[PDB]
Design a protein around this ligand. Structure first.
Ligand code: HEM
Ligand code: HEM
Ligand code: HEM
Lengths: 726, 726, 308, 83
């Protein structure tokens, strides 16, 4: 026995707040959390306690510390079959990462609709409010490798596998409502442009390099999703606090055969929230696993990620009623024109057991639809349908990837396909072809119908010649970027200007910067001028005279495009740092922890060393991390309770911790003699909105802090932060 | 419904003789047959009846006859995900075949020992006569591809996977007691020499070409196994009528630590039986699947392949008591010197359900041993230990090939190995390393002991310098080929000579045939001269004067080396052709069938067309095949009953049937006017040994025939067959 | 005419200091720097300028901007073999990364001995001071993926392929003179313990987690290389300013058959230098490619990495 | 791609074109060709957009599909003319 006698090696199998217990595989942390898919994986879960160590052939091993050798200082012998199996398996551990979205984090959960949608769709998972569909969801960045950092500036993926009773449906979306390009033929060009450059394989996780901006300057259709990327949408706080979108128009098909166009939305019930760029960039260094960690720890705490599925629905007869093409995936459908109808709720409530087996090997593909859905001719969706099956057979080693446990349907699947590498299913059917008489033609085709029917495509009319040509209706590139720009708050605009300015400053060939600023002048002259000033570029008179693009169907703005213009804050699952001293005022700590607990906000107790400190009343406080070990970047607000403030008053790291949190617009709360830290961040005696201060930490102090936290950041401080050296 | 109304599409789920029903997947044919391994596969067996046809994602298919197109004469659309999945799976069905032994045929069964062998081995599967161990056995040729023919001249593999309670043990043997080469380093050279030549990839399934005999002529260590391959051992009648051998000396280790050297044997309880060359060669054309078919039909009829495991046991202190090295795999241990001790019985009693999932994907490797067994320094075994794991991860797609269902142990297996392509097991252990405290060090090592202990290698002494050198004790190449030659009957020796003469005739470079005749002259002069005569080569005076090699430990023959010197016939499961006419005498047929039934001998009723014929007394006789359709090659004897003989007397195919059977030494029985056929095979009026004849088919006509079948072939006919034009 | 008319898109083919010009493929930046290995690769180098765009089967492409569809707003057709080949190649670009040392940066160069070592070794590449051996060198971290950060705290790999006249010799070393473990049987245990933990796959590029220190606390043989990793050896300023070591004792064999034990070293002629931890950890965020970049730009500037 | 080990099967010597072939496709298992293009995407400025598209024409032109007229609904249906 190498475990400690006290049992402290094993985390409690109950919900616990971040940092309170070591994290664990999902089935051991939350063994009572079940759904049909989770249960179905029991055939392949493998335990360990009380079992002997063996080879993969079942032979017990006596000595797992040594190779077999001729004498104990002799050569290793070829007959050591136990060493060679162990080292061969290790030698073959890695598989290819995904070509894009290689970096991602996943969890299990469940979905149910609010009401039956049978009037618009015959899909079975949308038919009954009390029929629950398991899901597995992977969130991702796009450009970086599987070992890249989480809080980069990038688009994020949001892929949901729904294990329905009529097949797997994969809704493979991103966190912005449009993509960069119009036709899948260009996907390798765009991805190669954004990815590390091919001579030296730099930069990882960043679009701030010449080839990406070269492509953008030469392909104005990219500008819309570039605007989203350069805004704070490119730097979410958490995968719990971003939107999701399917991007393409799809179809819903009901039992009477009617097609309705649909775009898919996920609304985060925790609200929309993003980092600021200096925080995000520094956090890729202090904790490159911040989003993976925060997601796993939110589910271990019971702060399950919840999202509302929503549909924008457009009747068939209204296909051409907008000033943009519904099938153009560089155009969004403004919610002021077509509202999102609430459809159902998805809750992620258990982490996987083994990241490689369940997350790395999962395969999501947007051609996996079910009866009641269909595609459209969007030319980027069309080409996606070829790529996901093709790449998943390369990455997962052959055509039986649907038999890898995470990807298996929970509903029946039977057909005449056979063989392939690592075939697990042993078919007993005498026939491997149809039509057959020798098995009375089973398994059999099923006619389409209202429920449980075979799939039939909606009989869309196709009229045209065989052409490689872009629809002229797709040839407008600046109106949607402008609508997005005008819908942002002033601080969000400033952050967009700063994102383009920072990125193009890293473009070494100056003419590319100039060409991008010329594109920006076709969107908005105020944006283009503000970027140009930061680049040392002066717009020409012709640039100053470019006519702005038209409004989008009369809209001058749509506030649903902003992260912050409409309040939607939720503090449950956020975290505060509490900076301890060696004689903390216990009464402050009581009041602080009670008010945080009432709102579901977690706390991390920090100090200048690890171990414990004792409060004024004898209470022994364990320290979660040092001020340098868990920087302000990792929390949403900072509280300094009273005590022996002289202990930490001259500590550089405690002072910096407040300066960094202040620069990054976080609420700060100072009780009693902790108000002496007002001098590090230059707060006048009268106080400042976003700094909470009082003689002690009481009801009123904590309510004011929590109100600031519900607004996420203190935007009004922005003019005060350029002078702080942090 | 496409099945016929009378149900005649479905084979009866009970034992039936070959030809009486269509063959079927083993769990449908014999649902009541079970063992622990067959039970454990049930979780991956897939049915078919009454299920809908789906994609692999579980979506029901409505039209499995057509691609999606724009108009019914239009182009196929990329959005047809059901076509693309079905075609992608088909496109990736094949996996690499095995480098050697690619052609092979397998079945499930069980093994039990006759008594506990605990005094000599602590192997669990040999510890208790009530302990039943499931097996899976694959028999194979060596040189040809998976789609080559079965009845070629080649060595045969005989590989047994024992699913024990202490691990998988794979006994990976062949049907001769030695191999061609001494050191594994030469295996690619020898296999490249026997395989199809590299410019043009000819010939398939044949050693009769220049490179093979070039190698043989230059590597006299090969001559021992070459003698076996050129004997009728190279052309077995069935996998059920051949011996098996582990070849190498291995060790048994008992609970007290004592090592005993062992060589493994399988004794066919159906007896030893081979074809003759002209019959085998022609049968590769008439039925290239003959041995696969015979094995599967024997198991469907209940003629289960049975084999007795036996051990030759040599004490450690007798290592050097022989004229040859125990560790040299080109030497056999004569049974006259060290008897085979009977160990237990293996019965093969169920066919697979799916050939590719269970046969093609099975992986046997001789390094898979269990506590109670160990290796020796045989330098061909030593290098095998590297090859099998290496090649199986290449062929089966990654390091998780033990999770393919046929390969999985039935006993527990738990370790710290993770990931790899196709990973099925989902580990819940918090640790993936040891030593660990975080899971209290589980799964844990187990010390060696008398049962259920960890594996520990026997502490053999090693002393010598690091050298690439053959042991001088291995440098004797001719004594064991001579012992084999002298142990054969005179007709077995004729067929050896004819095997070398035919194969060397197909070597285009004459000097290679001369060099191989020179090697034969070092084994035995009568052999050498008889082959030389057939090649037009004259021995030199010096060749006529080479001194024969020494006897082996005083032996000038060992009759256990001969197929036929000691009768071990068994007629059960053999087959007779019955040549019908349009008015058969029914009393003849009743007697024939009743006597054959009583000895478990099958029959096939042949005619000049399919359908039925009617007997003298009105009995309707169903025809199994035409004369041309089921040639004499495929049966053990031929019976022609009386009746309207004029119906078939001038039928070329019926006369030819008897001439082929006659040439190949098969018993032939002629009743009543069927005696007219004596003229086509030139039999005298007074008869000859091997031709049974009488006014009717009984009293003793069937006993006489069945006695001839017990002796397999009519060797005394040999001098008569050269005159027959067949 | 997408290039600027002033030609400022193309870097000068002469040594230039970091940042002065866009970086480029070696054969375009320094066409006149040659060695026998670099010359032998000319058979497979592919240019681009002035050539038509083609499929991999050599068919010229007319419109690389659009898929073939029935009507310009219609469905994409299966017959579009140009789109299918281009997206099939893209779909299969990635190969598995190295199980360890997945993150690395490499360059070409050459080796010459100072004098003949025929007295102690018959290795042909050490037999003559005028015999130049081309090399290719890869420097690496150990634990993180290929897309992890360069200035982590970790051991570094220093692998040199010598293309000799009597065969390839690979000297596969690290930047500290010992390893963490004694017997290869334990290498999957130790690597599993330092790698991201298996439930959640955290942390990347760091040994600062429970399983690593669990293994170290139970296997005191690891403490010597742990000391080196916790020192500033674990955070080099550049691959140019660290030492290299083969770690193991090997043998040299001379023509007379005498064996001498040897351990191999590389001394950085630019000196030894390391970062400090707060700087290295921050730099993993501000520039995760800092060591790859610095090596590439040192070579483009003429500040060639040299090692003895 | 399954049978020959990856997407560079056209680099296996028997399958190589004898005419020029140049494009922006990169990587894949057993990649033989070492591309020197600064660009691996188009449109690009950094290599003056090379290698470049070629319009269709009477000789040495790029490939353009014959502009067949397609009219019909999306159906899984066999032409009656094939019955
Ligand atoms: C609306 C535009 C797109 C969206 C929203 C989208 C979204 C995503 C997401 C979220 C993933 C990762 C799924 C996971 O977590 O495993 C992914 C993977 C992938 N995507 Fe897309 N993508 C789009 C366009 C495309 C295009 C145009 C292509 C190629 C024609 C493409 C090819 C791929 C490939 C090859 C993968 C890797 C899939 C795997 O290995 O399993 N994507 N995409
Ligand atoms: C006593 C000498 C040998 C015996 C009795 C023997 C027997 C066998 C048999 C029976 C199989 C087929 C197993 C099955 O049915 O799947 C086989 C496969 C094979 N043998 Fe051996 N063999 C011998 C020597 C060697 C040597 C010396 C090497 C290489 C060092 C070797 C390499 C292989 C390879 C690579 C396979 C294919 C295995 C697979 O793909 O799963 N064999 N051998
Ligand atoms: C002195 C101890 C060791 C040193 C100095 C060392 C050094 C290295 C270096 C420098 C690399 C990267 C080569 C490159 O740049 O591609 C490498 C890769 C590797 N090492 Fe070692 N290593 C050590 C021990 C081990 C052990 C004990 C094993 C396994 C028994 C091992 C297995 C590997 C593997 C599997 C790779 C990836 C190779 C590839 O994919 O090409 N290493 N090691």
């Amino acid at each position: 026995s190498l475990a400690p006698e006290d049992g402290s090696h094993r985390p409690a199998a109950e919900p616990t707040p971040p940092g309170a217990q070591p994290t664990a595989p999902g089935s051991l942390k939350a063994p009572d959390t079940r759904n049909e898919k989770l249960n179905s994986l029991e055939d392949v879960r493998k335990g360990s306690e009380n079992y002997a160590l063996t080879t993969n052939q079942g032979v017990r091993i006596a000595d797992d510390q040594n190779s077999l050798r001729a004498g104990s200082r002799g050569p290793t012998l070829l007959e050591d079959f136990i060493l060679r199996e162990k080292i061969a398996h290790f030698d073959h551990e890695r598989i290819p990462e995904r070509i894009v979205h290689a970096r991602g984090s996943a969890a299990h959960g469940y979905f149910q609709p609010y009401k039956s949608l049978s009037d618009i769709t015959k899909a079975d998972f949308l038919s009954d409010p009390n029929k629950i569909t398991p899901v597995f969801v992977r969130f991702s960045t796009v450009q970086g490798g599987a070992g890249s950092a989480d809080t980069v500036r990038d688009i994020r993926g949001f892929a949901t596998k729904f294990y329905t009773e009529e097949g797997i449906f994969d809704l493979v979306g991103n966190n912005t409502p449009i993509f960069f390009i119009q036709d899948a033929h260009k996907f390798p060009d765009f991805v190669h442009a954004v990815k590390p450059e091919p001579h030296w394989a730099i930069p990882q996780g960043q679009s701030a390099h010449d080839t990406f901006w070269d492509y953008v300057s030469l392909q104005p259709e990219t500008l819309h999703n570039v605007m989203w990327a350069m805004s704070d949408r490119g730097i979410p706080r958490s995968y719990r606090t971003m939107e999701g979108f399917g991007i393409h128009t799809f179809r819903l098909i009901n039992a009477e055969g009617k097609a309705t166009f649909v775009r898919f939305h996920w609304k985060p019930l925790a609200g929309k929230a993003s980092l600021v760029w200096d925080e995000a960039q520094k956090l890729t260094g202090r904790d490159p696993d911040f989003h993976r960690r925060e997601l796993w720890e939110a589910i271990e705490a019971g702060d399950f990620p919840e999202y509302e599925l929503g549909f924008q629905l457009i009747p068939e007869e209204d296909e051409f009623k907008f000033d943009f093409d519904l099938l153009d995936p560089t155009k969004l459908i403004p919610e002021e024109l077509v509202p999102v109808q609430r459809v159902g709720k998805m809750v992620l409530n258990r982490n996987p057991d083994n990241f490689f087996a369940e997350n790395e090997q999962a395969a999501f593909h947007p051609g996996h639809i079910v009866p009641g859905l269909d595609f459209t001719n969007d030319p980027l969706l069309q080409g996606r349908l070829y790529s996901y099956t093709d790449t998943q057979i390369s990455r997962l080693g052959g055509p039986n990837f649907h038999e890898i446990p995470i990807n298996r349907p929970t509903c029946p699947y039977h057909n005449f396909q056979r063989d392939g590498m690592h075939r697990m299913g042993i078919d007993t059917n005498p026939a491997n072809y149809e039509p057959n008489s020798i098995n009375d033609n089973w398994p059999r085709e099923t006619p389409p119908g209202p429920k449980r029917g075979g799939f039939e495509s909606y009989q869309e009319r196709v009229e045209g010649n065989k052409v490689r040509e872009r629809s002229p209706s797709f040839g407008e590139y600046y109106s949607h970027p402008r609508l997005f720009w005008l819908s942002q708050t002033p601080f969000e605009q400033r952050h967009i200007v700063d994102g383009f300015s920072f990125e193009l400053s890293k473009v070494v060939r100056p003419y590319i910067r100039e060409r991008v600023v010329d594109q920006l002048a076709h969107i908005d002259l105020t944006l283009a001028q503000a970027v140009a000033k930061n680049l040392g570029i002066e717009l020409t008179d012709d640039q100053l005279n470019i006519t702005p693009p038209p409004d989008v169907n009369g809209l001058k703005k749509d506030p649903s495009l902003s992260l912050y213009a409409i309040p939607d804050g939720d503090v449950k699952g956020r975290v505060v740092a509490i900076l301890l001293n060696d004689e903390v005022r216990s009464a402050d700590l009581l009041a602080i922890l009670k008010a945080l607990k009432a709102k579901g906000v977690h706390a991390k107790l920090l100090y200048s060393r690890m171990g414990e400190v004792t409060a004024d009343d004898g209470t022994v406080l364990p320290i979660a991390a040092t001020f340098a070990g868990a920087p302000s970047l990792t929390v949403d607000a900072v509280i300094v309770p009273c005590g022996n403030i002289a202990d930490i008053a001259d500590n550089g790291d405690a002072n910096y911790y407040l300066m960094e949190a202040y620069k990054h617009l976080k609420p700060i709360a100072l009780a009693g003699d902790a108000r002496k830290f007002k001098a590090t961040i230059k707060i006048a005696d009268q106080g400042e909105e976003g700094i909470v201060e009082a003689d002690s930490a009481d009801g009123s102090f904590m309510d004011e802090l929590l109100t600031l936290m519900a607004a996420h950041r203190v935007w009004s401080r922005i003019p005060k932060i350029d002078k702080i050296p942090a």
